[PDB]
UniProtKB/TrEMBL annotation, chains C, D:
CDD domains: TBP_aldolase_IIB (cd00947). GO terms for molecular function: tagatose-bisphosphate aldolase activity; zinc ion binding. SUPFAM superfamilies: Aldolase (SSF51569). Binds 2 Zn(2+) ions per subunit. One is catalytic and the other provides a structural contribution. It is an enzyme of class 4 (lyase). The gene is kbaY. This is Tagatose-1,6-bisphosphate aldolase kbaY. It holds the Pfam family F_bP_aldolase. Coiled coil: none annotated.
Amino acid sequence: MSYVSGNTLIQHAWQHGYAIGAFSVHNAETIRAILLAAEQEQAPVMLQIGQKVISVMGLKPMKEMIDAFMHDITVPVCIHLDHSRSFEQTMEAVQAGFQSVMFDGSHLSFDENVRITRAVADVAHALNLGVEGEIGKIGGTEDALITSCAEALKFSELTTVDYLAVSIGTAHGMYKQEPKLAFERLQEMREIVKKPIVLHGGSGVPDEQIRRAITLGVAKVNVDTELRQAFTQGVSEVLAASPDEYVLAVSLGRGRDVMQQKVIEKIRLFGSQGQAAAFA
Amino acid sequence: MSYVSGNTLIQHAWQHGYAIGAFSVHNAETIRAILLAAEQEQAPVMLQIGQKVISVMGLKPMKEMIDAFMHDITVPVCIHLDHSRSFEQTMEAVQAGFQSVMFDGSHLSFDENVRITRAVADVAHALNLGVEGEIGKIGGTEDALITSCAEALKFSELTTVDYLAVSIGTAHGMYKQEPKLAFERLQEMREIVKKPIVLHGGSGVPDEQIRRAITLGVAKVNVDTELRQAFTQGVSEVLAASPDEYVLAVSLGRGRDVMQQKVIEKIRLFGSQGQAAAFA
Amino acid sequence: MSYVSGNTLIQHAWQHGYAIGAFSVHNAETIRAILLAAEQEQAPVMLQIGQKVISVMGLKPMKEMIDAFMHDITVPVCIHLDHSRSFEQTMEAVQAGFQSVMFDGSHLSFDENVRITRAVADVAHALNLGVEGEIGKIGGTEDLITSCAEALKFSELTTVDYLAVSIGTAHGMYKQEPKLAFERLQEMREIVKKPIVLHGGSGVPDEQIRRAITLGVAKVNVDTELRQAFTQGVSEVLAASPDEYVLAVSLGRGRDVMQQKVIEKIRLFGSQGQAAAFA
Amino acid sequence: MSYVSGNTLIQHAWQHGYAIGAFSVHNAETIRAILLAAEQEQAPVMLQIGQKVISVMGLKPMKEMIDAFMHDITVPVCIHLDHSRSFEQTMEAVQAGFQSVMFDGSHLSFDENVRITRAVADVAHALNLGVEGEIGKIGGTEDLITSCAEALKFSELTTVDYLAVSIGTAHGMYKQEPKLAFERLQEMREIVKKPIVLHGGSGVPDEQIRRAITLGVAKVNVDTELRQAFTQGVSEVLAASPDEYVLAVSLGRGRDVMQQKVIEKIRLFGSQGQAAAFA
Ligand SMILES: O=C(COP(=O)(O)O)[C@@H](O)[C@H](O)[C@H](O)CS(=O)(=O)O
Ligand SMILES: O=C(COP(=O)(O)O)[C@@H](O)[C@H](O)[C@H](O)CS(=O)(=O)O
Ligand SMILES: O=C(COP(=O)(O)O)[C@@H](O)[C@H](O)[C@H](O)CS(=O)(=O)O
Ligand SMILES: O=C(COP(=O)(O)O)[C@@H](O)[C@H](O)[C@H](O)CS(=O)(=O)O
Ligand code: NA
Ligand code: NA
Ligand code: NA
Ligand code: NA
Ligand SMILES: [Zn+2]
Ligand SMILES: [Zn+2]
Ligand SMILES: [Zn+2]
Ligand SMILES: [Zn+2]
């Protein structure tokens, strides 16, 4: 299997001014869409297993499903636990052979966030897998919110996370108003924190703002909603036109194909196309 | 894992006048729908991997996906290769640890069908997995067709198949005209062939004809199209009502739930509910 | 697989006045000897993978070898990492699916021992596997006693599930007969109130083992004496027939004599028949 | 894993005037000896799992043990079932993911041998693994030659990829020096035109091996001589120190001496460096 530490991927992206796309998976077709995109683009990629799919499918089953679809894949892949709020769940992903974990202590006090994140990072460092933490809440779309540079620095130094999620103008879900990222804040963090930044709420952010953020040290861009939209739209083109089309290979296949093209588009936006060669 | 030879399942069904449902799988949600149904019904079940899903997902990946979803399953499960027209493909399923295989030589001459089916059966017998063969073409829905008792007997004795697919009034797909099964022919085969019969084209056959066929020795009923219809209808209830519902857990979840209820209905039709206790 | 948390095994032993034998494995035959013994005795067992076998065979290979021999085994089995002096190595055992780990910080300062042992314990608790730590050096026989207060403090700060302490044993063939610190064990039974692990279990007189178990020893580590038994079995064959090249015969005999030693230890420990308690 | 069809290995050897060594495994140390040898020599190798080790350790466990030791191996490896006299057992090896099988019908009538061997070969061809059959009994040394016409007929009716024939070898330690039937091998090279398997390869003089390989022997089976080497290594340690209980030392030495024997056989066979041809 071509599985690689998320730290190896993110640091290479960070050092060369591109980003790794971190694409949320939900089932078989979504896994295949992402992997086929990465393989086509000769790009390293992260597949994110988050809280919702863990509640529906289970953590270990989703890991095993990825494994089952890796047989023909040659590009660097990293399975990443997204938005974990439990030390136990994060350790379960470690035990199941994930290449990256996010412990999201962002709803905890500063001190508790630090304590658990550091514990998770010490395990990740020991086993050469990536660790992500978050300082500052990032909510849903449905000035004060922005993470300070000093807070990011202190959190970063106390936890030793490999890559850091901060609050910089994004939110999860379909954007009601177009977001405007805190570019000055990203630049400060690049100079002072000096760690790869993770952009949460990557779906629906204008392309130009993504490209700029990446030049300022965003090295991981999380995308979920926009892929689910693409998948759903592909399914709809089929079932709306032919409600009695019962061949799942056709209806879900189209969802898969449309999602694949979205993932290709994101890989290219992020600058990660061709970068598989850097890891061979 | 609670995996059991398809021969053990089918013979028990045959000996006690019920049938094992053989439910075609296509992806993660369809697997889960079938397994959750079987577990709820305390029923033995077959999961069929056929030609279409092998072309989309691959043979080994689908096997591995089933494995990944078996963690919480206690009822007897048998993974079955459906409609294989290649000795190689059938041997690949054997190598991948299937519990049952169908080599479908029905488009070959009688002698070639016999030759390859026998070869497949000798391997199946050696490894204690189920083997299914077919004599007589069963086409699509879109007197002469009916398999003779003598042909079924000769094929059966030359091949040593464990369970036998024959042409008895069904066809694959959505029925244009309601089918009428060849009940007299089934009764002859029960008395003379004396092997469990497999009913292909089980989707959309009237319940009463299914129940009667089972009393005449049909012990495996294959169902695919009707489950795909149920899955598709569940997805449609969601996406038609809310085209912008992008939570796959909701849209595909509903497909999964509606398919699960169809599978429950089929298990009960077939008489296999509660029969897990017979194998504990 | 019939794999069980080391904590489940040890707590049950501790509550019921018996001990789990923790038998060191080295290769295929030694694994099978221990498993065949446990199955015969219907006993829960720990198989210990320690530093020596990790250097020779590798951590993950030895884990996978145990897995390969578990096909016909029904009794509770716990794979346990022995004498780990590295957080990394201990995390590797966790990642490879061990059911128990010992982080042995006994060569570190009290504070460092506590710090790393606690980190290890938090991971073990999260994943429902056993954690063992050690306070007090336990050396070799070729070459003292842990205080009750130190054992208590270490135990409460680390949250280990079972605790190795220095109570008069040593690793290796004993030159002189050991005498266990029974008074100290008894204090610990009342004050520390955790299952105790006895290191250096090889060659300890049976009656001292039985008494130690009543005072709260719930895990007894045995390695040298099994390797002696294995080596003696091989010798009976090769000394008698130097040209006996059938390994099934020479190493088979090592395996059989080792199996009987393991049976003897299981029965000494009181763990025979106890598989029933965990079904 | 660097696992390769036995047919790919043997055909390449046959085409290039060398042979693949087929080394019998018995346990962890013997597996590692063979693999470490192959890796050192950058040689393709077969590891043979035969009847004895199946009775002691089990077919699937030995397969899984090899898997566990392949983590650091880069050279072509083929796991091969040796001396199977059962269609069921041969199918079990196929199901467990072996890269080559021998169905040995040599104690059956010609017709039965053909029937079962052909059935086995059809499965092997379907799954791209090697198939070996045998025509002519090959016995033991403690206790003849296959005709060219019989070898041809058997070969054409079974479609085996490589063929074991009776050409003057026997299993075990040779009492008297063997003399291979070189004239008969040479006939077969021109007429049968299939890679030949040499059973009873232990103790065959080096020069006779080299000549046999030029006449189309492309697989040489070696077991007894490796078990001798392993046993001699163990003896050097236990005879000198009966109380040496460190298995890493006693069995380690067996492993080291066996490794050197395997290196010697690889080089004899001409397979050193040949890993390059398959990358
Ligand atoms: O931060 C993210 C990007 O968000 P958008 O795609 O909406 O822009 C992801 O990492 C999601 O937050 C994730 O879907 C929630 S769960 O853990 O998967 O349940
Ligand atoms: O015989 C069957 C029942 O048919 P219906 O469900 O239409 O009534 C199945 O066994 C199918 O024939 C199968 O879907 C084709 S493939 O091999 O899966 O591609
Ligand atoms: O403590 C033990 C008992 O010692 P005895 O058998 O001599 O009485 C074991 O747990 C050993 O200490 C172990 O062999 C060392 S290593 O880690 O396996 O290298
Ligand atoms: O043919 C062989 C070479 O014999 P020598 O090493 O004595 O020369 C091997 O293939 C053996 O025949 C094998 O040990 C028997 S078993 O099947 O492993 O029990
Ligand atoms: Na968003
Ligand atoms: Na139908
Ligand atoms: Na000792
Ligand atoms: Na010989
Ligand atoms: Zn997020
Ligand atoms: Zn059909
Ligand atoms: Zn010790
Ligand atoms: Zn032989």
